[PDB]
Design a protein around this ligand. Structure first.
Ligand SMILES: C[C@]12CCC(=O)C[C@@H]1CC[C@@H]1[C@@H]2CC[C@]2(C)[C@@H](O)CC[C@@H]12
Length: 241
């Protein structure tokens, strides 16, 4: 069980957003705390990804690119799991100090995206996703979005992605065919959600000075340098189906 030993050992712990929960639920306050949470989670996503089996086989530039394209999906998938295990998924458990109820979903001006994130969260229950299946699926999501012109060493990426798909198939095997279809459909469903959030993030960065929404340093860098490559079609998700 070497592969799952590693995935369990490197899984990040709790990350707080730093939100002041006794101020009013304003658009600016909620979105600023979400941006701060993103900046804080990015630290952990980088350390997690660098410790994955085989990740250092990738060329160093492909290592940062793959993190910088897939962070949205990774973070939404993990938040869906937190919500499913914590508030059972009529709320969104972004962080222990940033839990969205319906009021916050409206004041954030993200209600429709939050609905879709809630549906993602509920699928962990409907499909009875095990912790091992969650861990393998999440690792795969790191290897599920790349430039259309390819990475600096695409061949090493294709081998690594192959091997993570094989590990997912092994966890299922330890009926099988139905399960694999269900899980790969679930993985595919993350990308349209992440794309809606990529669009929201970009639009909000552009008009941030006017809606009093603060963007941390690495969030502002990634949203203005990398996210527009996704929105303009230069970087695309790899779908199973
Ligand atoms: C990844 C984050 C923060 C981490 C998390 O749990 C999921 C959540 C999804 C919405 C993102 C948010 C970071 C800040 C963003 C990108 C806002 O700018 C717009 C949508 C927000």
């Amino acid at each position: 069980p070497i592969f799952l030993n590693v995935l369990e050992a490197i899984e990040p712990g709790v990350v707080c957003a730093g939100h002041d929960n006794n101020q009013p639920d304003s658009f600016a306050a909620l979105l600023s705390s979400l941006n701060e949470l993103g900046e804080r989670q990015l630290v952990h996503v980088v350390k997690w990804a660098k410790a994955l089996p085989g990740f250092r086989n990738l060329h160093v530039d492909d290592q940062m690119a793959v993190i910088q394209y897939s962070w949205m999906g990774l973070m939404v998938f993990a938040m869906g799991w937190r919500s499913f295990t914590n508030v059972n998924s009529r709320m969104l458990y972004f962080a222990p100090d940033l839990v969205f109820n319906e009021y916050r979903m409206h004041k954030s001006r993200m209600y429709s995206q939050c609905v879709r994130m809630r549906h993602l969260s509920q699928e962990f229950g409907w499909l009875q996703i095990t912790p091992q299946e969650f861990l393998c699926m999440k690792a795969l999501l790191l290897f599920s979005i790349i430039p259309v012109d390819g990475l600096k060493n695409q061949k090493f990426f294709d081998e690594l992605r192959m091997n993570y798909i094989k590990e997912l198939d092994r966890i299922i095997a330890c009926s099988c065919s139905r399960r694999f279809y269900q899980l790969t459909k679930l993985l595919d469903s993350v990308q349209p959600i992440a794309r809606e959030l990529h669009q929201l993030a970009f639009d909000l960065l552009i008009k941030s000075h006017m809606v009093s929404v603060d963007f941390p340093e690495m969030m502002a860098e990634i949203i203005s340098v990398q996210v527009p490559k996704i929105l303009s079609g230069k970087v695309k998700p790899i779908y199973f189906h």
